[PDB]
Ligand binder design. Structure first.
Ligand SMILES: Nc1nc2c(ncn2[C@@H]2O[C@H](COP(=O)(O)OP(=O)(O)NP(=O)(O)O)[C@@H](O)[C@H]2O)c(=O)[nH]1
Ligand SMILES: [Cl-]
Ligand SMILES: [Mg+2]
Lengths: 208, 9, 130, 998
C-alpha cells in the first residue's frame, strides 16, 4: 500500500520535473533547485489495487544537499537519475549509487537516463553499462516527451508487490455533478477568462 | 514477380 | 463421462466523439498555462440520463485529467497563440477529487480537429439542454 | 514553533526534543515533516553541532538521531579534522571505536541496527583515512586480534575492511590528492597478507552464514586490486567454485567474486595457472547444473516468474559466463575432454538469451558479437560452435527490433546476424523461409511477428552471393504477396504491404539488376501515395527516397527498351503523383528527385531537369510575387503565407540533395525572395507595433516568421555546399546582408530570429576570408544588441545564446581582423562576452566560450611584439587567468575542467616562455626588471590567498611552483589542479602533495 522511494542524482538532471509530471501532468521549464528534500505522495491504480509511493525528491546540488544520505534511511526503493546530455552526471552515477546502497543494502533500484528528447545526446546508449553488475533496471526516459516516463514506477511496483503481471489500470470515473454558475461570480470569471485567452499556450510547435 | 497486383482492398 | 474442466465506471455510457488532445489549466496566480494531461478526450453519453460529459485520461498511467459535464452555458473561445485550441471556463471538474472550478485550454493535432471538436462540443450542449 | 528549540546552543541540547524532530521528519507528513526537515538541516549545518554528537550517541534512544550525529561527525572529519586540537582528534577516535565495540557486543543491537553500525563503520573509515597508519600503526594487528574474540566483531571488521578497500582503491581518484591515495594504497598493500590470512581462515572454517557473506563481500573489493597470487597460490578458488556456490546465501556474492577473478591480471604462459582457470569454471558450471537448474531449463520462464532473487542470479550468471568466455574460451577449445564444458556454458547463454529483458539481452548480444566475429576470422574454430550458432540464428531473428524504419540494438543485432549468415548461409536461408511459412499457415501470424521477420530478412542484405540473393529475394516477395492477398481488411493488408516495401528497399543490388522490377516497385509506391490509410503515404515516400539514394543511377540513364530516363517520367506526372500527400511528404518527393537529378553530370541536361522539377513551385512563386508586390495586404492572408512557406520549403528540400548544382534555381528566385523577406519583415514589425509583443505568438506572425526562417535556411543550405565561392561573394552576399542585418538590429529583441546568426555563421565559415568588410558589418549589426539580450541571466533567449557564440567563434577563426577593427570599448565587451560564456553550464555555450578564449590567445600571440598584442596582455591577461581559475575552483563547472586546464596552461606558458614582451605590472607596484614570471607567481599567490583564506601560504606556493613547472605537461598539470581542488575542500592539506609528479 505504501512505499518510501528516494530519488537521487546530479543537480539539473530532471528529478523534480519528473516527479511533478507524475503529480500534476505539468512540465516545469524552469530550474528551481531542490533544497534538501521534498516529499510527495504518488498513487498509481493497478490490477492489484492502489499503490502509494512516498517520493523523497532529494537535492543533487551539493551546497543544497541537506541531510544527504540521511534521506535514504528506511527507503524501500530508489531511482538514480542522470542526464544523457551531460556526461558528468553519468560519471557521478556510481557515487550516488555508493551512498545509496550503503544505507539501503537490498532494495529495487531503477537507473534513469533523462532528457533523451534532446537531439545532441552525449551519453550514448552503448556507454551505459553501470547497471549491469549492480542489478539495476535501466530506462531511457524524457520528462518532456513522456518517453518511458511510467516505466520506473511500473517496474518498482512489480518488485515491491512481488507480482510480475501487475498493470496500471484506469481509475474509476465517477459521474461529474451538474452546473449552476453564480451570477455574482459572472463578472469575476470574465476577468480570469480574458487573461487566459490572451496568455499564449506554450510549445505551440509540439504535435500536441 | 507480379508486384503490379498488390492491393490494399 | 463428464470430465470436470480446469478452473472503470464508463460501461453504462456511449462514446459520441473521441480525439487526441493536450489539456491545460490556467494558473492565475502564476499567470501561466500548465499542462494537465495528454490523451484521448472522449464525449461520453450516459445511457440512463442521456447527459454528455467530457472524460479524458493520460496515456500510460490512464489517470483522469478531465471529468465534467459539457454544460450548455459554456463557451469555447480562441487562444491568442493558436488556431487549433479552445479556452473555456469550467465550474465543476472532478478529475482530482472535489468539484473544482478551472479555466481550461485544450489543443489538438490540427485546426480541423479543433473545429470538429467545437462542432461535437456544441452538439453535446444541445443534448444536455433537452 | 516549539521544534526550533534544538537550534539554540546557549542551552543544553534536549535529547528528547531532538528525537521528536527526527521522528516527525522520518515518520510524519506534510507541514509537520517539512518543518522538521528545515530544522534538522539547520541543526546538522551548525559548525558546532559536532560537539554535541557524543551526547546524542550516548543518550539518544533513536537510531536516526544517532545516524545524523554521525553525519555531523563525518563532515568534521572530512573537512576540519586537522584544525582540531589533538585532544579532540584522540577523543573523537576513542568514542567511535568504543561505540562500535559496544554495539557489536549487544547481540540485540547488532541484529536490529545494521544501518547505524554501518554508518559508524564508515565514520571510522574516515578517521582511518586521516590517521592511519602513521598515527595508528596497530589498527590492523588489533583488528585481526579482536576478530577471534567474537563472531559479531569479526563480521563487523569485514564490513570495516570492505569500506576501507572501497575508499582507498575504488573511490579515491576524485576525493584525495594523488599522494594521499598512493600512501593509503601502499599502506593497505603492506598489511594485506595478514588481512588475507584472516579472510581465508574465516572462509575455510566459519559456519556463520552472515559472517561468511560479509567476508566474501570484502573479498569482492579486494579482487579489484590484489595480486593474483593470493587467488591462485591458495585453495580459495576451490572454496569459491564449490562450497560457496551450493549455499544460496553465499551464491550471489561468490558468483560476483568469480566474475572479477576472471579479470585478474594473470601470466599467460603458465600451464598450471591455465588448469586452475579451467578448473574453477568447471566446478562452477557443475554446481549450477546440480544445485540450481540443468542446462535444459527454461530460463525465459524462470526470469518472467521473478521468484526471490532469480532475476539477479540470472543476470549475474550471464555476466560471469560472458566475462569468463570472452577471456578464456580458447582454454576450452582444444582439449576434447573440455568440449562438453565449453558447449554447456554456451548452451546456458543460449537459454539466457531468450529472456525477455532488453538490458540483459544486450549483455548477451555483446558476447555473441565477440564470438561470431572470432569464428569469422580465426581458423578452425567455427565447426566447434555450429549447433550453438544455429540456435543463435533463431534467437536473433525472433527478437529482431525495429530499425530506423532501439536503433542501436537493431545495428548490434544486424552485425551478429550478418556474421552468422556468412558462417552458414544455407542454415540462415532455411530458418527464414521456414519462419515465413508459419506466417502463411497462420500458426505464428501476427503484426509483430511478420514485422520482426521482415526486419531480419532485410538485415542480412549483402551477405549472400548475388545469385543466391536473387533466388532468396524472389521467394520472399512471392510468399509475402500471397500472404497479403490471403489477408482481409485494410489493417492487415497494410502491414504486409509495408513489410514487402521494406524488404525491397533493403536489397538495392537486386533492384539495380532488374530494372523492370524496380520500375514496378516505384509505380506501386506512387499508387500508395494516394492511399489514405494511416501510415501508408509516409511509408511510400520513405521507401521512395531510400531506393533512390541507392539506385539513383538507374533513374538518370535511359534504360534499354525505354523511351526516356525514368526521372523524366517521374517529373511529368509529379502533380498527379503527389496530389494527395501532405506538404512534408511532397518535399521529400522533390528531394528524392533532386538526388536523381544531381547524378546527371551534363550541365545543360541537369539544369533542364532542375527547371522542369521546379515548374510547379516556380509558377506558384511567380504568381505570388506578382500579386503580393501589388497588394502587400495579401500576405496577411494565412493561406498565401502557408503557400509561400511551402514553396520555399520545396526549394530547401531540393537544395539539400543538389547542393552546388542548385545554383541555377536559386538564381531564378533569389532577388525576389530577398524582397519578400523585406516585405514580411515590415509586416511582422507592423503587427508587433499594433498588437504588442504578444503578436509574436499569434498564428499570423509565426507564419510570417516561418517564411523568413525558411529563406535563411535555403541560403544557408546552398552556401554551405557551394563550390563556386566567387559567385557567392559577388552575387549572393551583398543583397543578403542588406536584407537581413539592419532588420535584425532594429527589431525589438522578441522579434529577432536566431536563424540570422546561424546563417551568418555559415557565410563567414565559407567565404569569411573573402569579405572582411562584410564581416565587420555583421559584427556591427548583431554583436552588441545580441550580447545585451543574453547578458542579464543564463536562461533567456537560449537559441540566440548558442548561435551568438558559434558566430563569434568562426569570426575569431576566419576573420580575426574584424575584432582588431572594433573600438576599444567594443573589444572589451568581446572579452566580457567570452568570460560570460565560461560561466554557463549549458555545454553548447561553455565549450565555445573556452575555445574562443584559446583561439583568441593564439591569434594575439601570432601578432608578435606589436602594440595591439602588448596592450591586450596589459588589459586582459590577468582577467583571463583569474576568470579561468574562478570556474576551475567553484565546483559549478566540472564539465569544462579539461578545456579550462588547457586554457590555463596556455596562459601560464606564455609567461614562462617570455612570449609576453612587456611587463604585466604597473610602474610603481614592483621594482624595475622584475620578470613577468615573478610577478605572475606573486599575483596568483595573492589571488588564491584572498579567494581561499583557509589555505596556508606554503600550500599556495607549493601549488604554484608545481603548476608552473608542469605547464608543458597537460596530464600532469591537470593532476595538480585536481589535487588543488581536493585541498581547498578541507583544512590542513599537505603542501608536499604537489611534489607527487616529481
Ligand atoms: N529537454 C528536457 N528538459 C528537462 C527534462 N527534464 C527536466 N528538464 C529540465 O532540466 C532542468 C532542471 O530540472 P529539475 O527537475 O529542477 O532537475 P533536478 O534534478 O530536480 N535539480 P536539483 O537536484 O538541484 O533539484 C529544468 O529546466 C527542466 O525543465 C527533459 O526530459 N527534457
Ligand atoms: Cl529482450
Ligand atoms: Mg529538484
Amino acid at each position: 500500500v505504501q512505499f518510501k522511494l528516494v530519488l537521487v542524482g546530479d543537480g539539473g538532471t530532471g528529478k523534480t520535473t519528473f516527479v511533478k509530471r507524475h503529480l500534476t501532468g505539468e512540465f516545469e521549464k524552469k530550474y528551481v533547485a531542490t533544497l534538501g528534500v521534498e516529499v510527495h505522495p504518488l498513487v498509481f491504480h493497478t490490477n492489484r489495487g492502489p499503490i502509494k509511493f512516498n517520493v523523497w525528491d532529494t537535492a543533487g546540488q551539493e551546497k543544497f544537499g541537506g541531510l544527504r544520505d540521511g534521506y535514504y534511511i528506511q527507503a524501500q526503493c530508489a531511482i538514480i537519475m542522470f542526464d544523457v546530455t551531460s556526461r558528468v552526471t553519468y560519471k557521478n552515477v556510481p557515487n550516488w549509487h555508493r551512498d545509496l546502497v550503503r544505507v539501503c543494502e537490498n532494495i529495487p533500484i531503477v537507473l534513469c537516463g533523462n532528457k533523451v528528447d534532446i537531439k545532441d545526446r552525449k551519453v550514448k546508449a552503448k556507454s551505459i553499462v553501470f547497471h549491469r553488475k549492480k542489478n539495476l533496471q535501466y530506462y531511457d526516459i524524457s520528462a518532456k516527451s513522456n518517453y518511458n516516463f511510467e516505466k520506473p514506477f511500473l517496474w518498482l511496483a512489480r518488485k515491491l508487490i512481488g507480482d510480475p503481471n501487475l498493470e496500471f489500470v484506469a481509475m474509476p470515473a465517477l459521474a461529474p455533478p451538474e452546473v449552476v454558475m453564480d451570477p455574482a461570480l459572472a463578472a469575476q470569471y470574465e476577468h480570469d477568462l480574458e487573461v487566459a485567452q490572451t496568455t499564449a499556450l506554450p510549445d505551440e510547435d509540439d504535435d500536441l | 514477380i507480379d508486384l503490379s497486383g498488390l492491393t490494399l482492398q | 463421462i463428464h470430465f470436470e474442466p480446469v478452473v472503470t465506471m464508463e460501461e453504462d455510457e456511449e462514446v459520441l466523439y473521441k480525439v487526441r488532445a493536450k489539456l491545460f489549466r490556467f494558473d492565475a496566480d502564476a499567470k501561466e498555462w500548465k499542462e494537465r494531461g495528454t490523451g484521448d478526450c472522449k464525449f461520453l453519453k450516459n445511457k440512463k440520463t442521456n447527459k454528455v460529459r467530457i472524460l479524458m485520461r493520460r496515456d500510460k498511467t490512464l489517470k483522469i485529467c478531465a471529468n465534467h459535464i459539457i454544460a450548455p452555458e459554456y463557451t469555447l473561445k480562441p487562444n491568442v497563440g493558436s488556431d487549433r485550441s479552445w479556452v473555456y471556463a469550467c465550474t465543476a471538474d472532478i478529475a482530482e477529487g472535489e468539484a473544482e472550478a478551472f479555466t481550461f485550454a485544450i489543443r489538438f493535432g490540427s485546426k480541423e480537429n479543433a473545429d470538429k471538436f467545437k462542432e461535437e462540443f456544441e452538439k453535446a450542449q444541445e443534448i444536455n439542454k433537452k | 514553533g516549539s521544534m526550533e528549540g534544538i537550534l539554540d546552543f546557549s542551552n543544553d541540547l534536549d535529547i528528547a526534543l531532538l528525537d521528536q524532530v527526527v521522528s516527525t521528519f522520518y515518520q510524519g507528513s506534510g507541514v509537520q515533516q517539512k518543518q522538521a526537515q528545515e530544522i534538522l538541516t539547520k541543526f546538522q549545518d551548525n559548525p558546532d553541532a559536532w560537539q554535541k554528537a557524543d551526547q546524542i550517541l550516548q543518550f539518544s534512544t533513536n537510531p536516526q538521531s544517532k545516524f545524523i550525529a554521525l553525519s555531523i561527525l563525518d563532515k568534521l572529519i572530512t573537512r576540519k579534522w586537522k584544525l582540531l586540537p589533538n585532544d579532540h582528534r584522540i577523543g573523537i577516535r576513542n568514542f567511535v571505536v568504543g561505540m562500535i565495540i559496544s554495539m557489536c557486543q549487544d547481540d540485540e543491537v547488532f541484529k536490529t541496527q545494521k544501518n547505524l553500525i554501518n554508518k559508524s563503520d564508515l565514520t571510522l573509515v574516515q578517521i582511518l583515512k586521516q590517521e592511519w597508519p602513521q598515527n595508528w600503526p596497530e589498527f590492523i594487528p588489533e583488528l585481526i586480534g579482536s576478530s577471534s574474540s567474537s563472531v559479531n566483531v569479526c563480521e563487523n571488521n569485514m564490513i570495516v575492511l570492505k569500506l576501507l578497500s572501497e575508499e582507498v582503491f575504488d573511490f579515491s581518484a576524485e576525493q584525495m590528492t594523488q599522494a594521499k591515495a598512493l600512501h593509503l594504497k601502499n599502506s593497505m598493500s603492506k598489511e594485506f597478507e595478514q588481512i588475507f590470512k584472516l579472510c581465508f581462515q574465516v572462509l575455510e572454517q566459519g559456519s556463520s552464514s552472515s559472517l561468511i557473506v560479509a567476508t566474501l563481500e570484502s573479498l569482492l573489493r579486494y579482487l579489484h586490486w590484489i595480486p593474483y597470487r593470493y587467488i591462485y597460490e591458495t585453495n580459495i578458488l576451490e572454496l569459491l567454485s564449490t562450497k560457496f556456490m551450493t549455499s544460496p546465501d553465499t551464491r550471489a556474492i561468490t558468483l560476483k567474486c568469480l566474475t572479477e577473478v576472471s579479470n585478474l591480471k594473470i601470466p599467460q604462459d603458465n600451464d598450471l595457472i591455465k588448469r586452475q582457470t579451467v578448473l574453477f569454471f568447471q566446478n562452477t558450471l557443475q554446481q549450477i547444473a546440480t544445485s540450481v537448474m540443468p542446462v535444459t531449463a527454461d530460463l525465459k520462464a524462470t526470469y518472467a516468474n521473478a521468484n526471490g532473487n532469480d532475476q539477479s542470479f540470472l543476470q549475474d550468471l550471464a555476466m560471469f559466463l560472458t566475462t569468463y568466455l570472452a577471456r578464456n574460451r580458447a582454454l576450452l577449445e582444444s582439449d576434447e575432454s573440455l568440449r562438453e564444458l565449453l558447449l554447456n556454458a554456451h548452451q546456458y547463454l543460449i537459454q539466457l538469451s531468450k529472456i525477455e529483458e532488453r538490458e540483459l539481452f544486450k549483455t548477451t548480444l555483446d558476447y555473441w558479437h565477440n564470438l561470431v566475429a572470432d569464428l569469422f576470422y580465426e581458423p578452425l574454430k567455427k565447426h566447434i560452435y555450429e549447433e550453438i550458432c544455429s540456435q543463435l540464428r533463431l534467437v536473433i531473428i525472433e527478437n529482431m527490433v525495429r530499425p530506423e524504419e532501439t536503433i542501436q540494438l537493431y545495428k548490434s543485432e544486424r552485425e551478429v546476424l550478418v556474421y552468422l549468415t556468412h558462417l552458414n548461409v544455407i542454415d540462415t536461408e532455411e530458418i527464414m523461409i521456414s519462419k515465413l511459412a508459419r506466417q502463411i499457415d497462420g500458426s505464428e501470424w501476427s503484426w509483430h511477428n511478420i514485422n520482426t521477420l521482415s526486419w531480419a530478412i532485410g538485415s542480412i542484405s549483402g551477405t549472400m552471393s548475388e545469385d543466391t540473393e536473387k533466388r532468396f529475394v524472389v521467394t520472399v516477395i512471392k510468399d509475402l504477396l500471397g500472404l497479403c492477398e490471403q489477408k482481409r481488411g485494410k489493417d492487415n493488408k497494410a502491414v504486409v504491404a509495408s513489410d514487402i516495401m521494406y524488404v525491397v528497399g533493403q536489397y538495392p543490388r537486386f533492384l539495380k539488376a532488374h530494372w523492370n522490377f524496380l520500375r514496378t516497385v516505384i509505380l506501386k509506391l506512387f499508387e500508395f501515395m494516394h492511399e489514405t490509410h494511416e501510415g501508408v503515404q509516409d511509408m511510400a515516400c520513405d521507401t521512395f527516397i531510400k531506393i533512390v539514394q541507392k539506385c539513383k543511377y538507374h533513374f538518370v540513364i535511359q534504360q534499354p527498351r525505354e523511351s526516356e530516363p525514368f526521372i523524366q517520367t517521374i517529373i511529368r506526372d509529379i502533380q498527379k503523383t503527389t496530389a494527395d500527400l501532405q506538404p512534408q511528404q511532397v518535399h521529400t518527393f522533390y528531394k528524392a528527385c533532386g538526388i536523381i537529378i544531381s547524378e546527371e553530370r551534363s550541365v545543360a541536361e541537369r539544369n533542364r531537369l532542375l527547371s522542369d522539377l521546379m515548374q510547379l513551385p516556380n509558377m506558384a512563386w511567380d504568381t505570388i510575387v506578382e500579386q503580393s508586390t501589388a497588394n502587400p495586404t495579401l500576405l496577411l492572408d494565412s493561406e498565401t503565407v502557408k503557400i509561400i512557406a511551402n514553396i520555399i520549403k520545396t526549394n530547401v528540400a531540393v537544395c539539400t540533395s543538389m547542393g552546388a548544382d542548385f545554383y541555377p534555381q536559386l538564381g531564378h528566385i533569389y532577388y525576389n525572395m530577398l524582397q519578400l523577406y523585406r516585405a514580411v519583415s515590415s509586416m511582422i514589425s507592423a503587427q508587433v507595433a499594433a498588437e504588442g509583443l504578444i503578436a509574436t505568438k499569434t498564428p499570423k506572425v509565426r507564419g510570417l516568421r516561418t517564411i523568413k526562417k525558411e529563406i535563411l535556411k535555403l541560403v544557408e543550405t546552398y552556401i554551405s555546399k557551394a563550390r563556386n565561392l566567387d559567385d557567392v561573394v559577388k552575387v549572393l552576399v551583398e543583397p543578403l546582408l542588406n536584407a537581413v542585418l539592419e532588420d535584425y538590429m532594429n527589431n525589438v529583441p522578441d522579434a529577432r530570429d536566431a536563424e540570422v546568426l546561424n546563417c551568418m555563421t555559415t557565410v563567414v565559415e565559407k567565404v569569411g576570408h573573402m569579405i572582411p568588410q562584410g564581416v565587420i558589418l555583421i559584427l556591427q549589426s548583431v554583436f552588441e544588441c545580441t550580447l545585451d539580450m543574453i547578458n542579464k541571466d543564463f536562461t533567456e533567449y537560449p537559441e540566440h545564446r548558442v548561435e551568438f557564440y558559434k558566430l563569434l567563434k568562426v569570426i575569431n577563426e576566419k576573420s580575426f581582423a574584424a575584432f582588431l577593427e572594433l573600438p576599444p570599448a567594443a573589444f572589451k565587451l568581446f572579452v566580457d562576452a567570452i568570460c560570460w560564456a565560461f560561466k554557463h553550464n549549458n555545454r553548447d555555450v561553455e565549450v565555445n566560450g573556452l575555445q574562443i578564449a584559446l583561439d583568441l590567445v593564439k591569434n594575439i600571440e601570432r601578432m608578435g611584439n606589436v602594440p595591439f598584442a602588448n596592450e591586450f596582455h596589459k588589459n586582459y591577461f590577468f582577467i583571463f587567468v583569474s576568470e579561468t581559475f574562478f570556474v576551475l575552483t567553484d565546483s559549478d563547472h566540472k564539465s569544462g575542467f579539461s578545456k579550462q586546464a588547457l586554457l590555463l596552461m596556455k596562459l601560464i606558458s606564455l609567461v614562462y616562455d617570455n612570449k609576453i614582451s612587456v611587463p604585466l605590472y604597473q610602474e610603481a607596484e614592483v621594482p624595475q626588471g622584475t620578470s613577468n614570471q615573478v610577478y605572475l607567481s606573486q599575483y596568483l599567490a595573492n589571488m588564491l590567498s584572498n579567494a581561499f583564506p583557509h589555505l596556508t601560504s606554503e600550500q599556495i606556493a607549493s601549488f604554484l611552483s608545481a603548476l608552473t613547472k608542469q605547464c608543458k605537461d597537460l596530464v600532469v598539470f591537470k593532476g595538480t589542479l585536481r589535487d588543488f581542488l581536493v585541498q581547498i575542500k578541507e583544512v590542513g592539506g599537505d603542501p608536499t602533495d604537489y611534489l607527487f609528479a616529481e
